[PDB]
Specification:
- The structure is cut from a larger assembly and holds chains A (68 residues) and B (48 residues).
- Helix content of chain A is 31%, strand content 0%.
- By secondary structure, chain A is mostly helical.
- Chain B is built from two helices and no strands.
- The termini of chain B are far apart.
- Classes of the chains: A mainly alpha (68), B mainly alpha (48).
- The PDB classes it as membrane protein.
- Keywords: MmpL5, MmpS5, AcpM, membrane protein, Tripartite complex.
- The entry is titled "Tripartite complex of MmpL5-S5-AcpM from Mycolicibacterium smegmatis".
- Chain A: MmpS5 protein.
């Protein structure tokens, strides 16, 4: 391999250098924005508790104030 | 003789220090465009 050893080793070295270049070149940057995760709850109406107000008396009418 | 000296050419062909991939430059430009105020990434301070 007197006339084969040189070009093969040259190609091997060039491939190694290209691989190193490709790997490290992309590491820079790659983190421009930060996006926080979202964890919401299911907004549904199943078995809602029911509150009832009742006003009654011997009078005809009344004035009523209440808290919703 | 054809072109100016190297000093003038270097003065008129200067390159930005930070690449556009830089997250900080992108952040400043994003602030500028969102707030609709500017579109650069460099600022100076005037002291009185």
């Amino acid at each position: 391999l007197g006339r084969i050893w040189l070009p093969v080793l040259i190609v091997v070295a060039v491939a190694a250098g290209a691989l190193i270049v490709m790997n490290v070149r992309t590491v820079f940057g790659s983190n421009p924005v930060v996006v926080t995760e979202k964890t919401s709850d299911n907004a549904e109406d199943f078995n809602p508790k029911v509150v009832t107000y009742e006003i009654f008396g011997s009078g005809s009418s009344a004035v009523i104030n209440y808290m919703d | 003789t054809v072109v100016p000296t190297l000093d003038e050419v270097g003065e008129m062909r200067a390159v930005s220090m930070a690449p556009n991939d830089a997250p900080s430059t992108l952040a400043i430009k994003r602030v500028g465009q969102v707030f609709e105020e500017y579109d650069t990434s460099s600022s100076v301070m005037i002291v009185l």
